[PDB]
Amino acid sequence: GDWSFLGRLLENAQEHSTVIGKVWLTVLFIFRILVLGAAAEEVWGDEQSDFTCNTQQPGCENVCYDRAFPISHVRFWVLQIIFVSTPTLIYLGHVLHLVRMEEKRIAGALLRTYVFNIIFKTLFEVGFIAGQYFLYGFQLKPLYRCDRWPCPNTVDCFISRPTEKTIFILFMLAVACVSLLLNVLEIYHLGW
């Protein structure tokens, strides 16, 4: 996917943000967007094509893949990025609104807005972490037993590249925990 438009706005936010905010944006670009574009999209490229089920039943592989992977991980992480970035866009918009107001004519209202930004980022991060955990856990096993109609009885289905996907799942989990740490540290730094 093409992230150029998002990147320009985020950089604008970087100018009007704290040092730890700059660190968070750098982590976002280098360790989430770049890793997706360069590494992870390829890992999940053949998710359905190489998914194989031991049966002669038409349509069992499709329904079993759908049940095994209701949403693909990469799409989940795309949404995650977009939602953790949106609050920064809100804050940047408020900043530019006040700057344009001054033209017409961090403290105060902007400070409350920055705090709300931090809070929403933290909450969306925790939410996507918990969601991923409940959907899959943090380990994709090679065997998926499926009993979804039209499949007769239970069929064995085999996931492609399970170990590599587990590695990247844990990598992205770690990145999200790091970003949570950065947000908490930013709250501490501003408050005290």
Q: Which C-beta is closer to a second copy: that of 116 or that of 158?
A: 158
What is the spatial distance between Cα 174 and Cα 135, in angstroms, rounded to a whole number?
Answer: 18
What is the spatial distance between Cα 40 and Cα 54, in angstroms, rounded to a whole number?
Answer: 27
Which pair of tokens denotes residue 125?
């991060």
User: Does 18 contact a second copy by CB under 8 A?
Assistant: no
Shortest separation between residue 34's beta carbon and a second copy, angstroms: 6
- Quick note: the x/- pattern for ligand MC3 over 106-135, rule CB under 6 A, is ------------------x--xx--x--xx
Restricted to residues 129-168, the positions that interact with a second copy (CB under 8 A) are 142-143, 150, 156-164, 167-168
Residue 128's binding partner out of ligand MC3, a second copy, none, with CB under 5 to 8 Å set by partner kind? ligand MC3
Please state whether the peptide bond connecting residue 142 to the residue before it is cis, i.e. omega within 30 degrees of 0: no
Among residues 44, 24, 53, which one has the least CA distance to residue 182? 24
User: Does 176 contact ligand MC3 by CB under 6 A?
Assistant: no
Residue 45, phi then psi, degrees to nearest 5: -65, -40
Residue linked to tokens 């931090």: 118
Q: Which C-beta is closer to ligand MC3: that of 71 or that of 111?
A: 71
- Ramachandran quadrant class, 59 (left: phi over 0; alpha: psi -120 to 50; beta: rest): left
Binding-site ranges for ligand MC3 (CB under 6 A): 67-68, 70-71, 79, 124, 127-128, 131, 134-136, 163, 167, 170, 174
